[PDB]
């Protein structure tokens, strides 16, 4: 199904069942359905911690570098996975969301202390 | 029983026993043989036993036979470059003919081994998908990972039906 | 060397010469019968450009694909007459023959 | 610098090929000229609203 | 009823009562399913014991309450394994109900995991062709300069307070739709006391 | 989803999308992080593109490819 | 200067190969598996001897000794410490490079900790991730319970030591801590009960001999070989012992006395052997039976 | 059926009869025993020295049902059904 | 196998392209704005709030 324009993208295709998500990392045309036809499978991502308390992420780095070199784009969740792996730099919003979380918990710690002080 | 003499020829096992896999240059293989004569016996058995095996391994090569056109049997190969390879087969047995063409125009065991390896790269063991293409369909099949809810119900805390209930 | 024609080299039998500078050639290939696992001939017609009109009905010819088709059905050209009808030259000895018999003995020219 | 993992793989490849250099892998960003997002784009390659007056 | 062998089930197969009832043949030797036609259904009944009530033709396991499917009672488990191929007979072979066949399959696998039941263990080849551990993936990587000095990998990972003129420029650009200016974040992640 | 021929919903005729509020400090810091991040990722993309082109040229006119081509041509003769 | 031989030296491999033996009936014991109807051939006496020769070659491949490796050193290498990520996640990520054409000992497998540290995976995490994405037949992601001390003693009571070594070889890597621990516990149980015949004509006999010679405890195996009229093996065992312990009481005694053949067993029995008295008696009994056969 | 069964079963050639008729060893090959050659019968008389002729292609008649089953082309809902031990 | 020509498709395709060049709207029509409602009368679409 030739699309009008478009391009290849490395993104997450959702699998699994209800309440049990599992992602396949695929290179596919951006206009294709999320879970439909793809060009190549480049890895997988299990977001649920396993018995060892680990989130397993498989990355076919050789083929990921190939498809980026062929003009493939990256979805935002995929960019953050590569940042966590050390393959890319940390995404600007992973850094900013971390700072927001620090300011949020710095206010809660301050509110908690003010309440105990009043007590 | 199966019809005809030597019905073993009409089995997939026999047809796959051919060891001649032509190089990419071979495009046409003509066979000139005589129906009678003791010196053309090996060429007749070659047409009877081996031509099916050659065609099976080389489906895109044209094979055409010709009967009683010349005094002696011979093979002729037409290559993509325009070169023609004449092979005189009079007095040779059908096994010697197969070994001859394998040496001059067949792929060696090394070239065939490599091709088989490049095929195995198409079915990566780590990929998940239908059984037709992958070993495993979902990560839930891997021991230690969270199993499928269809077999082991998830804890109430990991279900949206009760996450929204508590939050709401 | 590239060409948009599928059949690059094919051998066939001339079955018609009624078109100008064009020979109608019957080409046969072995096709496996999936149920019987027996090979049967499957024939197809090709029009070949014959500039010199040297083809005779019944001779075996070698066809070469053209770079691009010169007509709706003319995608090949006569590259060589393998076996001239009734005038075969034994490729193994180079002598003329009539069926399975020599017209000139190979011992003539040693 | 390279990202942590890419750097480790570039260095591990050197040592596998016998290279004993201690120079740090470095990305060249001189050729990467970053234009401001408000830089005037090419108007020639821009579309135009089609006719459909309301 | 209450079986006196529930604690040591392997003793029943060694008693005289067992030898008189079964002899040297398997416990399922004399059982036959009742069904129409010559070809039986491809699944045995789901269970012979339904709400503490037994059906009319209970299977070889359910018809003798002293036979206990336990991973230690290996002599009983061996009767449901092919001695020549090591495969577990499918349920229609012996006639056991689906319930007991699952308990047999689990007990057989548990007995093999504990080494109580002998099964064929093949001789496999090594995973790797070379056993060298010199590659950087399993060895030390020369630490980067930032990691030695204790700096972030890239300088823009850290917060840098922007100049006052650039903040004035943004307060004019977004005048009327501003939030309160945030300062540098905490140096570490706080924690609830 | 709708097509361009489907009519606009009447309950959305007067909807006005108000832009979010801006934090000047975080807005400026985040703007600089995106520039540095995208400069580094573009430098990486250029290297991956050069690797893909190098491998294609190597398999076509490499020393090992042209050497194997002459060997096969010699064995044929 | 003078290096002591390794397990894979041609001289050592030749000695251990002869001591192992080659029994086609045991090496090719009928396996309990799904069966097919056998095939039959009509052979002359020459064709049968050739078929038996090929079987011996296929057996020498099946008896190929696995290399004895030293315990691998733990992995502790940090690639980056991104402190800005501290406290943003509660679970750690395990990233595995699944590029097909890479040796498993060269694959990068890293871990992003909740503290923000990017470190290389440990040996145990590596072998577990490799089994997840490149599943090897016979290996499990979770360690089987058969390798617990309580369950191994059950296997030893049934004289299933070779099964334990086949299970261990399929589950653990040769340089793994679990692999070496199980092999040594199996060798020690064989030495305590004199079950050396269980490993003969197997690929594990050489590894067992290598363990006894390095730990200086060949008295049990030496007695077992003399009682079985394997003096050619018992003499090679003492020679291999001197080669790996050149500056020893027995090695010097053999040089001073120029001992050869059975004399080596006597020199070893007096100097370094712990059960020297039981070796002289066992060796004396052998020479008697050999004299009766001579007379 | 009964009369035919007894005829076939009574007219079968044992391995010893095959060894005596051809003066050769009858060697058995089992996949569960690997390449180990197992001699099941040897001729009581002298043992031939000339090998049995190895015809490149045997001219034996095949049963289409056996060939069709070996090629996975045999489809039947009634074959290979689970049944009680017999 | 010879696809039947679709003449009405080609005809309509040229007529549409022609009418789009002879009836094309001008800048004074496309880019006019109502400064009270801040909408373009050509399409009735409002401008973004940050441009008001
Ligand atoms: S199939 Fe894997 S979660 Fe259901
Ligand atoms: Zn039951």
Author numbering:
A (entry chain M): 10 to 128
B (entry chain T): 2 to 169
C (entry chain N): 4 to 113
D (entry chain 0): 165 to 218
E (entry chain O): 47 to 239
F (entry chain U): 27 to 103
G (entry chain R): 64 to 358
H (entry chain D): 345 to 430
The authors write:
The human mitoribosome has a distinct structure, it receives mRNAs with involvement of Leucine-rich PPR-motif-containing protein (LRPPRC) and synthesizes 13 respiratory chain proteins delivered to the inner mitochondrial membrane via the OXA1L insertase. The aminoglycoside streptomycin targets the ribosomal small subunit (SSU), but the therapy with streptomycin was also shown to be coupled with a bilateral decreased visual acuity with central scotomas and an altered mitochondrial structure. Previously, we reported mitochondria-specific protein aspects of the mitoribosome, and in this article we present a 2.4-Å resolution structure of the small subunit in a complex with the anti-tuberculosis drug streptomycin that reveals roles of non-protein components. We found iron–sulfur clusters that are coordinated by different mitoribosomal proteins, nicotinamide adenine dinucleotide (NAD) associated with rRNA insertion, and posttranslational modifications.
To characterize the binding under close to physiological conditions, we added streptomycin to cultured human embryonic kidney 293T (HEK293T) cells at a final concentration of 100 μg/ml and not to any of the biochemical purification steps. The resulting structure of the SSU with bound streptomycin was determined at 2.4 Å resolution. Although compared to bacteria, human mitoribosomal rRNA is known for its substantial reduction in size, we detected and modelled a specific nucleotide insertion C1048 paralleled by a stabilizing tetraamine spermine (SPM) and NAD. Four other cofactors reported in our structure are: two iron–sulfur clusters (2Fe–2S), adenosine triphosphate (ATP), and the added GMPPNP. A unique feature of our structure is that both 2Fe–2S clusters are coordinated not by the same protein but by two different proteins, which is an unprecedented occurrence in any other known Fe–S systems. Careful inspection of the map at the improved resolution revealed that the reported nucleotide pocket binds ATP with an Mg2+ ion, and the previously modeled GDP was misassigned due to the limited resolution. Some posttranslational chemical modifications of ribosomal proteins can be identified directly from the density, and our study reveals a mainchain modification 1-methyl-isoaspartate at position 184 in uS11m, and the N-terminal acetylations in bS21m and mS37.
